[PDB]
């Protein structure tokens, strides 16, 4: 396959986020939920070994998928939860690509912020896909897939 699993993955992702205005009465989570830190200062993160960087991410997509599920699990059978859900679909492609490359699953891990705002969960996803992931799709790659 491609280094475009990232691109069609990023594509598919605005499209769902966009749809969060079709949903009447969207309420900021009744419980703050952890998410894979939206930090834009990854110069030092670049120096670390080829696998490590990938291992930090696997750990960070696991926490994300874990975040989606927990906020979708403070919430009933709605429209948010319904959408906050094919998002889980998208997260899972990423998780499978990284687990496969790495030959293992890893634990939930890394620096976090908490969010009641559903929007910012739809966001750490797009943000991971744009940084940590991207700066580790550009160095040729042991493919990504």
């Amino acid at each position: 396959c491609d280094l475009r699993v990232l691109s069609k993955l990023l594509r598919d992702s605005h499209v769902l986020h966009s749809r969060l205005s079709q949903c009447p009465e969207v309420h900021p989570l009744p419980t703050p939920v952890l998410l894979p830190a939206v930090d834009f200062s990854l110069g030092e993160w670049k120096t670390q070994m080829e696998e490590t960087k990938a291992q930090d991410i696997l750990g960070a997509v696991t926490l994300l998928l874990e975040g989606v599920m927990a906020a979708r699990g403070q919430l009933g059978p709605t429209c948010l939860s319904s959408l906050l859900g094919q998002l889980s679909g998208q997260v899972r492609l990423l998780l499978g690509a990284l687990q496969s490359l790495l030959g293992t699953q890893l634990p939930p891990q890394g620096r976090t912020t908490a969010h009641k705002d559903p929007n910012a969960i739809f966001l750490s996803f797009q943000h991971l896909l744009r940084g940590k992931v991207r700066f580790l799709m550009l160095v040729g790659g042991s493919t990504l897939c």
Partner: antibody
Framework: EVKLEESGGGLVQPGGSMKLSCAASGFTFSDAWMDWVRQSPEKGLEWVAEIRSKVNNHAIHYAESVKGRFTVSRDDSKSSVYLQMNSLRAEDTGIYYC???????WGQGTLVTVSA | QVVLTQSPGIMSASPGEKVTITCSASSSVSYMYWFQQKPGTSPKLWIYSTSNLASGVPARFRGSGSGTSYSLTISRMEAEDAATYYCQQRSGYPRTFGGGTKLEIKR
């Protein structure tokens, strides 16, 4: 929160057959890779088998000392994983454990005695 | 068929003593993983990815090494630390473990 309960162990005679079950709760089971790991005073901890998730195509791997004899499977719908054991040898004796998410979660273990 | 070997097979120590256990690998591996096990209960993840402590694991522990040689150090150990520790590698299949270091206490 996340729990795994083996059942199905106890006595089986050499050359018998026995099926282990493992019930998961409290996380999305079809998202988990699962593994079977057995223990005895002599051999120590020995990995037996791994079965991957739906997204990881359900890839299977076996310990060499077990090929032809043990089969592993899962039922996502049922949140469960299994170890179908055949032509059991005395050396298969030991506590057997399901482990979930690549050795992050561990059941309580079941004791498998192969004797006549 | 990567073979793992753990040094002092057994050892004792006192609270406030530095402890250092070694895992040697038969060929090069990118990471080591560790597990702790106390009698009559199940192994638990202790250290993964060489140097990351597991949920539940105190800051007095540190994992390190690379290639062919790794280790688990406790800076100043505590009674609750007495157990068997196993290294495990994941560079392919089979998965193999080392045969344990029993860390017991002296009194």
């Amino acid at each position: 929160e996340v729990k795994l309960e083996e059942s199905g162990g106890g006595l089986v005679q050499p050359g018998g057959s026995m099926k282990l079950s493992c019930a998961a709760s409290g996380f999305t089971f079809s998202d988990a890779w699962m593994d079977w790991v057995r223990q005895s005073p002599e051999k120590g901890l020995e990995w037996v088998a791994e079965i991957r998730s739906k997204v990881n195509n359900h890839a299977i791997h076996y310990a060499e000392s077990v090929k032809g004899r043990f089969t592993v499977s899962r039922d996502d719908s049922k949140s469960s994983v299994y170890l179908q054991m055949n032509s059991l040898r005395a050396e298969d004796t030991g506590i057997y454990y399901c482990s979930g998410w690549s050795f992050l979660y561990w059941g309580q273990g079941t004791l498998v005695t192969v004797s006549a | 068929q990567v073979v793992l070997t753990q040094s002092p097979g057994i050892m004792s120590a006192s609270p406030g003593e530095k402890v250092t256990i070694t895992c040697s690998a038969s060929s090069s591996v990118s990471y080591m993983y560790w597990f702790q096990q106390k009698p009559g209960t199940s192994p638990k993840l202790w250290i993964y990815s060489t140097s990351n402590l597991a949920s539940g694991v105190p800051a007095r522990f540190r994992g390190s090494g690379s290639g062919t040689s790794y280790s688990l150090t406790i800076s100043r150990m505590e009674a609750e630390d007495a157990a068997t520790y196993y290294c495990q590698q994941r560079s392919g299949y089979p998965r193999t473990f080392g045969g344990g270091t029993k860390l017991e206490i002296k009194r």
